[PDB]
Amino acid sequence: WTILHYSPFKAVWDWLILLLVIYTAVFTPYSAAFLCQPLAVVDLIVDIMFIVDILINFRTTYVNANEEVVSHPGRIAVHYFKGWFLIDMVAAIPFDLLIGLLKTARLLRLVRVARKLDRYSEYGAAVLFLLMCTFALIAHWLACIWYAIGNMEQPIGWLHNLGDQIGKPYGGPSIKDKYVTALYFTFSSLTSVGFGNVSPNTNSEKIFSICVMLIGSLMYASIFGNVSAIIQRLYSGTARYHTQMLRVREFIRFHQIPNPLRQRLEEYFQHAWSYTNGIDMNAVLKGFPECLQADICLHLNRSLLQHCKPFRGATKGCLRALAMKFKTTHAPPGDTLVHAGDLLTALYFISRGSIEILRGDVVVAILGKNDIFGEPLNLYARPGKSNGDVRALTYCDLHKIHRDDLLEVLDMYPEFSDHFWSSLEITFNLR
Amino acid sequence: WTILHYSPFKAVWDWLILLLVIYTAVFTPYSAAFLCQPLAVVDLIVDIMFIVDILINFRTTYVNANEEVVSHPGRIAVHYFKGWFLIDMVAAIPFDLLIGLLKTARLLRLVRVARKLDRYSEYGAAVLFLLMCTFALIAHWLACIWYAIGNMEQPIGWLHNLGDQIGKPYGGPSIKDKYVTALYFTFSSLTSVGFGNVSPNTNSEKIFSICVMLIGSLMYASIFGNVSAIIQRLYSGTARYHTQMLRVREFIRFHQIPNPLRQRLEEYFQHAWSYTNGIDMNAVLKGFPECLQADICLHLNRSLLQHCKPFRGATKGCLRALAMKFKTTHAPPGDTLVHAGDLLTALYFISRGSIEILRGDVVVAILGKNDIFGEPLNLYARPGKSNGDVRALTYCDLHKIHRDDLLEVLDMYPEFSDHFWSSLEITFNLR
Amino acid sequence: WTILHYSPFKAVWDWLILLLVIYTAVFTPYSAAFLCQPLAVVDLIVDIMFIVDILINFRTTYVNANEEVVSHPGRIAVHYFKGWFLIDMVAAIPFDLLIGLLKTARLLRLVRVARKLDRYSEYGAAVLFLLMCTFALIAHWLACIWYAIGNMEQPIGWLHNLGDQIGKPYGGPSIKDKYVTALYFTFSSLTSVGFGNVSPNTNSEKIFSICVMLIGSLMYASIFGNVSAIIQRLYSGTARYHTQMLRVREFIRFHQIPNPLRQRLEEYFQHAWSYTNGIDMNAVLKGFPECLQADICLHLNRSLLQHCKPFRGATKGCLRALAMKFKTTHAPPGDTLVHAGDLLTALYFISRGSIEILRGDVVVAILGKNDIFGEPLNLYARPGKSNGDVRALTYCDLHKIHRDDLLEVLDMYPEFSDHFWSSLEITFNLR
Amino acid sequence: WTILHYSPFKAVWDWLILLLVIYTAVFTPYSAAFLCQPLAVVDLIVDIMFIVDILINFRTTYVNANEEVVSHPGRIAVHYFKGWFLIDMVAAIPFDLLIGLLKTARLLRLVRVARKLDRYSEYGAAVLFLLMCTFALIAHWLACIWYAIGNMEQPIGWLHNLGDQIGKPYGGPSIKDKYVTALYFTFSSLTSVGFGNVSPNTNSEKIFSICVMLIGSLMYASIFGNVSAIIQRLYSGTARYHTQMLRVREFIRFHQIPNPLRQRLEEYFQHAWSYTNGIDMNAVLKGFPECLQADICLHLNRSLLQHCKPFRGATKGCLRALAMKFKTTHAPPGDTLVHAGDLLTALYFISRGSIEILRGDVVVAILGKNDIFGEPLNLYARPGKSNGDVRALTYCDLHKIHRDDLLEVLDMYPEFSDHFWSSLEITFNLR
């Protein structure tokens, strides 16, 4: 009967607790300033729910700084005591015994937001909503303080000016006509607008206005600098792509690069970006060593599994090693590659698309999916010639290995190399 | 009778459609709030044009996520249905049957802007114009809402204050004197100015003012943060050049570096930047492999094509191989280079400018454009001596190859090396 | 009887001097504008304290640009003279002899803040407090100038409007009711709010308002841009971690990467970040060469000190050499590594956690802390076979060395290698 | 009788021309709106000076895009014609023949600022002054337009409100009391303050206010974003140093690193930064190839010139080669280095400071400035031992060479090596 701290139940329970804390924090200052039955009913509901939360905290698991995993109620009690329980215990104190200031301790429940703030941060767009909610909460608190100051100093404040403006001279303005204007002034002072309908006129209201101006200016600047940061990150991924494209284009325009090869270069650029997205796979590859290096290579190592029968006998390490050495060339139909006579160092294979090698207007080796063609290895020791040049009917998304690397790795295995040598099958051997 | 989706006709057609959507979106809220004949004439024209657009969309091509190219009307119907047609179909519904709210569905045509937003996005300055137009559109909508609120609540609102200010007490202000002030207030509340001529005075106008203040503050911050971003990119290319220059100059000032060599170093810096612009060509070179690597090398591979007769017999692969190994040095007249006695490893060639090698006050090898001079290769195997030091009359923009690399590549070809050996011509052989 | 310039006594003394300078700078303009006894008492105390500071400056040490360390009173006098003494000497001039402008020279003591500004600068949050204090000080000075202008021009200024607003027509407003409003206006003009209670009405007040608007706009923009900078650095460390996580997750989602290996990869990522924090240790390692390179390597060089007896005889250089070649792999229980049959190149050791090698359902070599197991070296010269695959009970935070590197280093030492060869002890030799 | 375009005379002449253009641009709109004798006197002076400028432009040199250097009056006429002469010629047209609008063509002289804007940009702080001057100029133009609108529409505008506020009902306000308020309003609308003293009340003033609000908001945002950019660059050099220090400190705190070696590491960090300033010299070294690589190395190649007699016979290339291979170690007194028994690969030399090698409590080889000590080379072929460990009395800022590199380079020269071998002198040969 133990609850996991990362269980999805804790997520919805924390959502409920957060919403309840927001409700309390919003409703208590308004009640304090402007003011059985629903208020005490909701108070009792809140107290019972938070008591249930305090008790259920005694059962959930936790992660220690040293011990990654720790459970059972023997260790939760010592950790939870002598800690954040000081703030939480005073929050859930029900008493009836006006003197309504004692409910301000409920604001301490807002601390519960900060200690789980990390988990809410895994979404990126939620930051904007949380920041706007916090700004509205600060505005609400400042409006509460404004109204409190007005009431306490009015036993020519802003209350009389408000009564004059909207006709209700003194009766007086209603509670609704006294809270909307306070929040209006608070926003007009945090956003630095200053409409002039309501403005401080005494000696304490001006000091409060100065304090609000400073706090709001600081908070506004920092918050919307953060907003600019999140917005500019999302748009700056695309802006980095744009800068790469601009770099390529200015490099082209500086070196003339007439159209016929320039179109190949450009289209190569877009189609390559379609798969790489600017990310260099080698960087994240080198971060993960040994078998973790090849686990990424395992994802492109589904090519020759079903296209070679002796290939199925490979062990984990052998398969890893043969996977790590494959290279991938990307070329949409229209890009021609090396041909006979030149260096036939790399043994060209296929990954996707199709290959239609043309040996002097004769199509040979029509293979499309992870097939085995190429040149002999141990009998050449020389960059000879092939049947004909490569041709591009479909995408030339193909695999490559290297003569030296492949011969070295095939000399590496004592027995796996013998097994592969027992069945050296090639779909089309093009001399 | 099929139209290409990337044809230039689609560009001007989408310009026309965009302008028409802007017209409708601007003119419908004003008509809704402040209000045969021209209005219905334009309405009919808009409906007919957008119906024509809907039908012509049934013929243009499209690009699938998987299939790069796909055409013919068999596949356009299934893709276009069950998609964005839901928003587009309701837009083009003409009916006469006041209740003018039903035209608000025309605002859905603005969605057509978003789905082609990428096609506008290659231009850099167009972002500013689009952002300003969107800001003006939001201001127009907020002014419309402001006027609607004023009219509905006035059967001491801002309308009476406006009538008092500009003398027309109530007749009343004209439609022109009622729309300019609303847009004025909307801008004075989005830009956070707050002049005080017009200001909310009731309980709904203040709530609307708070909402406008929040929305405008957020939009203003984000939009002009983006504006700052585009401005700082364009100015920060030059600022990056400035920082490179600052790095160079602080490095010079930290190490004294008296004038005689410092002027050479500096002038080298500016003239090198004039050609490279800070861009490292090797970085973009390595992005394109195999023949895509040498396509860039082909652009500087026009030196010995017209300056050597056996050079014309090279195949594409041989040409690529010989092009990839060339290096280029830039030195305007005034920079002296290596001379006799020292390592004559690299075989110095020419690319531009002119070379006037001086062998002890005797000028030899006066060659300017992609000429072949240097030292013998197979008979030295030793860094011997040359006729004299290099001299700089014109720019020393010259080619270089390496002894080891050149001998290895000339040993690489079985037959091309034999052909080149058959005609080993040098313009001036300087021992 | 000499005081060190970096002694902690100087820290508290400079704190006291700074606080006294702030006191003087705050209190002198207010006295100048709005105005024995405590005023002269404090004046005398300030003068005496700053005289004591001037004399004690004649004894503290200093650091020359060329000479890092220099002391004794012979050299302090020549350096301190012909320097900043010109500003400091005029500050401490007591005279009684109204003409209260002569106290403005005390503002020169604020220069003492700038010359020790670096010593405050290691803290990060202190920048915010200093910036806010400077902003408040500028606001105070501008309020002083505003009140001075008002008084000098009033022998329909803002003073009469203030007297009208808060009822005290003219007696007149009190000194308290005349300073709060001036500072209020100064803040409402620096923050760009413009409430409208107090506003310039003459021809000099408008010029002053323009000057204040320009200065405040510039200072506000620069200061809160800096505030945004410090905020975004602290939050952008976490944002850089977030971007790394986003890169990893988009790379995973682009390549499918089903759950069974994806969970291993992810958990590897978080636990690796827990130890490296994104910092590449090799970068800072390469900054320090020779023995400074191995000092960092000495911190992980406490493994075999207590786990091998001949290991204690190593000199400092031998210890450095053996430490620099060790590698560390992190794998919490759940990650399997290379096994028998595959390349047993690296000699696997242990650093933390525990190792429970399983040789065909038989557990062998149960070693947890910096233990020595593996394979023989000189008798294989071949990647042979081990007892069984590695197993993960506890964290596989383990050391590794390389066959070639270890054999080369053991061939390097003439005598240390002989000593190690004399006692070649292995805790569990697994063939 | 030709003037160089980069001569310092052109600098002061351009300063004078710029100041004159600023004078004209400031004074013409004010004269146009608010208005022999000084005005025509200054007009004649300006016309004569700009005619002199136009003629002197016919003699100065210029730089073509292709030709770096070009002079003589034959080529200046063709280039200067069909170009920017269209704007410049209309500027200098004197005529007497009110209709004062024709002087607006003088604003075209402001274009002269843009075409020489690059040369003013080599200073960094001048950007702030130029931006502030441009902002003031835009404010002046907008105030001019405001006053023009007011006068033309007043045959209840802002003029009547101004006359009411400052008591002069209508006579009317003076020209001084009509220009200060216009500029006041223009600044209060560009900075987004909105005091409320003067505010638009008609239907054209509100449109003008909207236009000014938009333009000023855009310009203000962009300009102070640039201001933030320049400020943050200068402070972000120090912030990058701070981030490097923080990286080092968090790396230390994560790995404990007790005090004794930690103080060495830290002090190493600061003293190394004292010379490197975070700049990696190798990066700028590799940018300059061949002899330009060694010219930087020439600046530290003043060590052994005066400390070795056969060293004076080195040629340019030999000296370059011997310079490029020297390494520099920096260590303040307190850092101990490698000693006898360990690898004596590097041949330790001296650059600055002093060296006091201690061979078992015996001080030997007391050499301080670029001296020659070390171990024999051709007779060891083995990492033997030295007399004693290195000791740090003064800064261990010393040179190093490598055994393999030094032996290879001394085998490289056929004759220079023979000359050096003829005199192989060592100040102190420590076995």
mmCIF file of C-alpha atoms in Angstrom, chain B residues 1-175:
data_model
loop_
_atom_site.group_PDB
_atom_site.id
_atom_site.type_symbol
_atom_site.label_atom_id
_atom_site.label_comp_id
_atom_site.label_asym_id
_atom_site.label_seq_id
_atom_site.Cartn_x
_atom_site.Cartn_y
_atom_site.Cartn_z
ATOM 1 C CA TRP B 1 -4.077 21.623 -68.269
ATOM 2 C CA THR B 2 -2.434 21.357 -64.845
ATOM 3 C CA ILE B 3 -0.815 24.157 -62.846
ATOM 4 C CA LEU B 4 2.439 23.701 -60.944
ATOM 5 C CA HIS B 5 2.344 24.617 -57.265
ATOM 6 C CA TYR B 6 5.740 26.354 -57.527
ATOM 7 C CA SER B 7 4.942 28.171 -60.779
ATOM 8 C CA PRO B 8 5.373 31.975 -60.699
ATOM 9 C CA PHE B 9 1.680 32.319 -61.614
ATOM 10 C CA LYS B 10 0.794 30.950 -58.176
ATOM 11 C CA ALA B 11 2.944 33.683 -56.617
ATOM 12 C CA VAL B 12 0.965 36.564 -58.129
ATOM 13 C CA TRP B 13 -2.326 34.715 -57.602
ATOM 14 C CA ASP B 14 -1.507 34.263 -53.908
ATOM 15 C CA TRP B 15 -0.532 37.944 -53.731
ATOM 16 C CA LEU B 16 -3.973 38.838 -55.097
ATOM 17 C CA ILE B 17 -5.714 36.430 -52.708
ATOM 18 C CA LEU B 18 -3.739 37.802 -49.753
ATOM 19 C CA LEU B 19 -4.609 41.397 -50.649
ATOM 20 C CA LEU B 20 -8.277 40.454 -51.008
ATOM 21 C CA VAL B 21 -8.260 38.707 -47.611
ATOM 22 C CA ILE B 22 -6.673 41.792 -46.040
ATOM 23 C CA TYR B 23 -9.352 43.965 -47.655
ATOM 24 C CA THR B 24 -12.170 41.782 -46.318
ATOM 25 C CA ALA B 25 -10.665 41.492 -42.829
ATOM 26 C CA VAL B 26 -10.178 45.264 -42.617
ATOM 27 C CA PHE B 27 -13.561 46.260 -43.999
ATOM 28 C CA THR B 28 -15.942 43.783 -42.380
ATOM 29 C CA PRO B 29 -15.539 44.841 -38.679
ATOM 30 C CA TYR B 30 -15.884 48.526 -39.529
ATOM 31 C CA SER B 31 -19.078 47.791 -41.467
ATOM 32 C CA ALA B 32 -20.347 45.619 -38.609
ATOM 33 C CA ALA B 33 -19.761 48.262 -35.933
ATOM 34 C CA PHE B 34 -20.231 51.683 -37.532
ATOM 35 C CA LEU B 35 -22.912 50.611 -40.032
ATOM 36 C CA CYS B 36 -26.867 46.813 -54.509
ATOM 37 C CA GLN B 37 -24.358 49.705 -54.037
ATOM 38 C CA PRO B 38 -20.537 49.348 -53.703
ATOM 39 C CA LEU B 39 -20.559 47.297 -50.492
ATOM 40 C CA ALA B 40 -22.619 44.481 -52.019
ATOM 41 C CA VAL B 41 -20.812 44.882 -55.352
ATOM 42 C CA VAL B 42 -17.470 44.288 -53.628
ATOM 43 C CA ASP B 43 -19.019 41.456 -51.603
ATOM 44 C CA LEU B 44 -20.109 39.706 -54.805
ATOM 45 C CA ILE B 45 -16.689 40.277 -56.399
ATOM 46 C CA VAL B 46 -14.959 38.805 -53.339
ATOM 47 C CA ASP B 47 -17.274 35.787 -53.272
ATOM 48 C CA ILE B 48 -16.773 35.082 -56.983
ATOM 49 C CA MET B 49 -12.991 35.456 -56.714
ATOM 50 C CA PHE B 50 -12.766 33.119 -53.722
ATOM 51 C CA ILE B 51 -15.022 30.555 -55.417
ATOM 52 C CA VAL B 52 -12.642 30.688 -58.390
ATOM 53 C CA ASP B 53 -9.781 30.171 -55.933
ATOM 54 C CA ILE B 54 -11.508 27.143 -54.384
ATOM 55 C CA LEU B 55 -12.044 25.529 -57.786
ATOM 56 C CA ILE B 56 -8.514 26.291 -59.025
ATOM 57 C CA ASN B 57 -7.169 24.659 -55.855
ATOM 58 C CA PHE B 58 -8.619 21.408 -57.247
ATOM 59 C CA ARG B 59 -6.111 21.477 -60.120
ATOM 60 C CA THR B 60 -2.771 22.687 -58.707
ATOM 61 C CA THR B 61 -0.108 20.194 -57.671
ATOM 62 C CA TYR B 62 1.053 19.447 -54.132
ATOM 63 C CA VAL B 63 3.930 17.819 -52.254
ATOM 64 C CA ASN B 64 3.192 14.913 -49.926
ATOM 65 C CA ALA B 65 5.213 14.224 -46.788
ATOM 66 C CA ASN B 66 6.341 10.869 -48.199
ATOM 67 C CA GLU B 67 6.014 11.379 -51.969
ATOM 68 C CA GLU B 68 8.025 14.417 -53.060
ATOM 69 C CA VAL B 69 6.166 14.666 -56.388
ATOM 70 C CA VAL B 70 2.500 13.835 -56.959
ATOM 71 C CA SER B 71 0.029 15.148 -59.535
ATOM 72 C CA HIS B 72 -3.182 14.313 -61.451
ATOM 73 C CA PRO B 73 -6.686 15.038 -60.097
ATOM 74 C CA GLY B 74 -7.096 11.528 -58.676
ATOM 75 C CA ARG B 75 -4.987 12.269 -55.590
ATOM 76 C CA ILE B 76 -5.758 15.961 -55.010
ATOM 77 C CA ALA B 77 -9.401 15.277 -54.109
ATOM 78 C CA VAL B 78 -8.684 12.796 -51.305
ATOM 79 C CA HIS B 79 -5.929 14.951 -49.786
ATOM 80 C CA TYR B 80 -7.834 18.241 -49.991
ATOM 81 C CA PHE B 81 -10.954 16.661 -48.506
ATOM 82 C CA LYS B 82 -10.785 15.784 -44.798
ATOM 83 C CA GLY B 83 -8.518 18.732 -44.071
ATOM 84 C CA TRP B 84 -8.495 22.528 -44.288
ATOM 85 C CA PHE B 85 -11.596 22.496 -46.516
ATOM 86 C CA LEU B 86 -13.758 22.748 -43.387
ATOM 87 C CA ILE B 87 -12.563 26.303 -42.723
ATOM 88 C CA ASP B 88 -12.525 27.321 -46.396
ATOM 89 C CA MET B 89 -15.983 26.072 -47.428
ATOM 90 C CA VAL B 90 -17.960 28.114 -44.889
ATOM 91 C CA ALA B 91 -16.122 31.270 -45.993
ATOM 92 C CA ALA B 92 -17.672 31.314 -49.488
ATOM 93 C CA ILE B 93 -21.377 31.177 -48.585
ATOM 94 C CA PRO B 94 -23.460 33.906 -50.275
ATOM 95 C CA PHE B 95 -26.936 34.598 -48.947
ATOM 96 C CA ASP B 96 -29.297 37.577 -48.823
ATOM 97 C CA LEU B 97 -32.318 36.170 -46.931
ATOM 98 C CA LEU B 98 -30.169 42.952 -40.015
ATOM 99 C CA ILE B 99 -28.138 40.455 -37.959
ATOM 100 C CA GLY B 100 -24.777 41.297 -39.530
ATOM 101 C CA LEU B 101 -22.684 39.065 -37.267
ATOM 102 C CA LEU B 102 -22.725 36.231 -39.830
ATOM 103 C CA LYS B 103 -19.999 37.961 -41.865
ATOM 104 C CA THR B 104 -17.502 37.235 -39.061
ATOM 105 C CA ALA B 105 -16.885 33.848 -40.714
ATOM 106 C CA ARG B 106 -14.956 35.810 -43.354
ATOM 107 C CA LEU B 107 -12.270 36.288 -40.690
ATOM 108 C CA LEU B 108 -11.576 32.568 -41.183
ATOM 109 C CA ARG B 109 -10.130 33.478 -44.592
ATOM 110 C CA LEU B 110 -7.246 35.021 -42.628
ATOM 111 C CA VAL B 111 -6.199 31.418 -41.906
ATOM 112 C CA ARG B 112 -5.151 31.285 -45.572
ATOM 113 C CA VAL B 113 -2.319 33.616 -44.540
ATOM 114 C CA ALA B 114 -0.942 31.151 -41.983
ATOM 115 C CA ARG B 115 -0.857 28.089 -44.240
ATOM 116 C CA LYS B 116 1.233 29.940 -46.852
ATOM 117 C CA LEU B 117 3.233 31.852 -44.224
ATOM 118 C CA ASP B 118 6.365 29.874 -45.125
ATOM 119 C CA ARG B 119 6.276 30.971 -48.768
ATOM 120 C CA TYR B 120 6.590 34.620 -47.684
ATOM 121 C CA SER B 121 9.427 33.846 -45.289
ATOM 122 C CA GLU B 122 12.557 33.819 -47.482
ATOM 123 C CA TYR B 123 12.632 37.618 -47.542
ATOM 124 C CA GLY B 124 14.054 39.271 -44.444
ATOM 125 C CA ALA B 125 12.577 42.772 -44.548
ATOM 126 C CA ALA B 126 9.076 41.461 -45.314
ATOM 127 C CA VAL B 127 8.823 40.234 -41.711
ATOM 128 C CA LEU B 128 8.829 43.837 -40.482
ATOM 129 C CA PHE B 129 6.060 44.874 -42.876
ATOM 130 C CA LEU B 130 3.928 41.845 -42.007
ATOM 131 C CA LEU B 131 4.399 42.454 -38.274
ATOM 132 C CA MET B 132 3.420 46.118 -38.612
ATOM 133 C CA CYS B 133 0.364 45.165 -40.676
ATOM 134 C CA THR B 134 -0.698 42.610 -38.057
ATOM 135 C CA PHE B 135 -0.228 45.179 -35.282
ATOM 136 C CA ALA B 136 -2.388 47.655 -37.198
ATOM 137 C CA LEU B 137 -5.016 44.950 -37.748
ATOM 138 C CA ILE B 138 -5.157 44.122 -34.028
ATOM 139 C CA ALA B 139 -5.443 47.839 -33.282
ATOM 140 C CA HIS B 140 -8.323 48.086 -35.765
ATOM 141 C CA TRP B 141 -10.152 45.152 -34.173
ATOM 142 C CA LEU B 142 -9.691 46.582 -30.679
ATOM 143 C CA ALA B 143 -10.954 49.989 -31.836
ATOM 144 C CA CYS B 144 -13.987 48.225 -33.316
ATOM 145 C CA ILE B 145 -14.672 46.486 -29.996
ATOM 146 C CA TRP B 146 -14.191 49.776 -28.127
ATOM 147 C CA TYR B 147 -16.708 51.586 -30.327
ATOM 148 C CA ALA B 148 -19.158 48.682 -30.060
ATOM 149 C CA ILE B 149 -18.934 48.747 -26.251
ATOM 150 C CA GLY B 150 -19.420 52.507 -26.240
ATOM 151 C CA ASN B 151 -22.477 52.382 -28.483
ATOM 152 C CA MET B 152 -24.091 49.461 -26.647
ATOM 153 C CA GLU B 153 -23.562 51.046 -23.229
ATOM 154 C CA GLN B 154 -24.753 54.449 -24.456
ATOM 155 C CA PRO B 155 -28.490 54.126 -25.308
ATOM 156 C CA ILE B 156 -21.124 59.093 -18.861
ATOM 157 C CA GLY B 157 -19.236 56.890 -21.293
ATOM 158 C CA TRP B 158 -16.328 58.016 -23.424
ATOM 159 C CA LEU B 159 -18.785 59.102 -26.131
ATOM 160 C CA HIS B 160 -20.151 61.929 -23.972
ATOM 161 C CA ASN B 161 -16.644 63.043 -22.996
ATOM 162 C CA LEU B 162 -15.662 63.048 -26.674
ATOM 163 C CA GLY B 163 -18.747 65.093 -27.538
ATOM 164 C CA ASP B 164 -17.789 67.574 -24.826
ATOM 165 C CA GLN B 165 -14.114 67.869 -25.840
ATOM 166 C CA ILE B 166 -14.608 68.522 -29.558
ATOM 167 C CA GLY B 167 -17.584 70.848 -29.489
ATOM 168 C CA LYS B 168 -20.673 68.922 -30.659
ATOM 169 C CA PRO B 169 -22.754 68.444 -27.494
ATOM 170 C CA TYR B 170 -25.666 66.023 -27.399
ATOM 171 C CA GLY B 171 -26.538 65.412 -33.652
ATOM 172 C CA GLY B 172 -23.350 64.397 -31.888
ATOM 173 C CA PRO B 173 -19.921 63.595 -33.312
ATOM 174 C CA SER B 174 -19.701 62.307 -36.867
ATOM 175 C CA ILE B 175 -18.734 58.749 -37.811
#
